Design a protein around this ligand. Structure first.
Ligand SMILES: NC(=O)[C@H]1CCCN(C(=O)Nc2ccccc2OCC(F)(F)F)C1
Ligand SMILES: [Zn+2]
Length: 140
């Protein structure tokens, strides 16, 4: 579980969005596993605007932050689950690291700010949904 809070926006994994997030929808993309809803209070996270490939992510299943190298945002095959059928998820970045079902929403951060959130995993792998191309998160 977890979210990004920037300006008047809440960014969550689309598969974990509450019915109230849908009522307050701003933008969603199933292919990216992302949903953004509007918020009443202003948030204080800063989104990174960079091409960093090293950062630190939060792993709730170990109660630990880990330093990781990660691949550039790309179209990656993700196995079927209870949330999606087998498909290519876009804007996804992979790292060698622990992840399990329950770790989605953990922030990936670099020196510039928030890069993305945990979205997928595998045997010794963790995938992050990138948010650095969503320039509009910094305005209105
Ligand atoms: N975005 C998706 O399609 C994910 C929906 C939930 C399930 N997704 C996974 O990748 N499960 C998964 C399978 C084996 C080891 C780790 C796993 O996930 C780690 C995670 F939950 F993302 F933190 C896929
Ligand atoms: Zn960066």
């Amino acid at each position: 579980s977890g979210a990004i809070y920037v300006g008047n926006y809440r960014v969550v994994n689309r598969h974990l969005a509450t019915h109230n997030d849908w009522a307050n929808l701003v933008w969603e993309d199933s292919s990216r596993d992302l949903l953004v809803s509007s918020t009443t209070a202003q948030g204080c996270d800063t989104i990174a605007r960079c091409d960093c490939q090293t950062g630190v992510y939060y792993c709730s299943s170990r109660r630990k932050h880990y330093p990781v190298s990660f691949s550039k945002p790309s179209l990656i095959f993700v196995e079927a689950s209870e949330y999606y059928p087998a498909r290519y998820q876009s804007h996804l970045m992979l790292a060698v690291g622990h992840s399990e079902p329950g770790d989605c929403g953990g922030i990936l951060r670099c020196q510039h700010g928030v890069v993305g959130i945990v979205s997928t995993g595998g045997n010794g792998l963790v995938g992050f949904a990138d948010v650095r191309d969503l320039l509009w998160l910094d305005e209105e």
